[PDB]
């Protein structure tokens, strides 16, 4: 999606393939997010019962978790949970 975001002229079939890869990447974004909904629910129930509703805490942690997945890299050899927990 970064390559197709550029203004350089490429093949239209190549741009279609890049859009397909971008759609697959967005599907991966989703799949990771519904993978980690359970852990953000657990860490939100860790912080409940203090004047703020449970589902509000879950959704705010979900915002923190999409922040986490925006700032996650595979170069460091650690699991997603221990890095996501700080942002949650």
Interface residues with DNA (CB under 7 A)? 35-39, 41-42, 45, 48, 54, 71-73, 76-83, 85-87
19: CB partners within 8 A, 6+ apart: 1, 4
In whole angstroms, how close is the CB of 74 to DNA at the nearest point?
Answer: 9
CA–chain centroid gap for 35, Å, is 10
4 or 37: CB nearest DNA: 37
In whole angstroms, how close is the CB of 2 to DNA at the nearest point?
Answer: 18
In whole angstroms, how close is the CB of 39 to DNA at the nearest point?
Answer: 3
Question: Residue 16: which of 3, 7, 29, 31 has the closest Cα?
Answer: 3
Asked if 58 and 44 touch (Cβ cutoff 8 Å), the reply is yes
């Amino acid at each position: 999606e970064d390559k197709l975001a550029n203004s350089d002229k490429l093949a239209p079939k190549l741009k279609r393939e890049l859009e397909i890869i971008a759609e697959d990447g967005r599907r991966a974004k989703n799949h990771l997010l519904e993978a980690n909904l359970r852990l953000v629910v657990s860490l939100a129930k860790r912080y409940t019962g203090r004047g703020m509703l449970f589902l509000d805490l879950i959704q705010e942690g979900n915002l923190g978790l999409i922040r986490a997945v925006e700032k996650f890299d595979y170069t460091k050899g650690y699991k997603f949970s221990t890095y996501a927990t700080w942002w949650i």
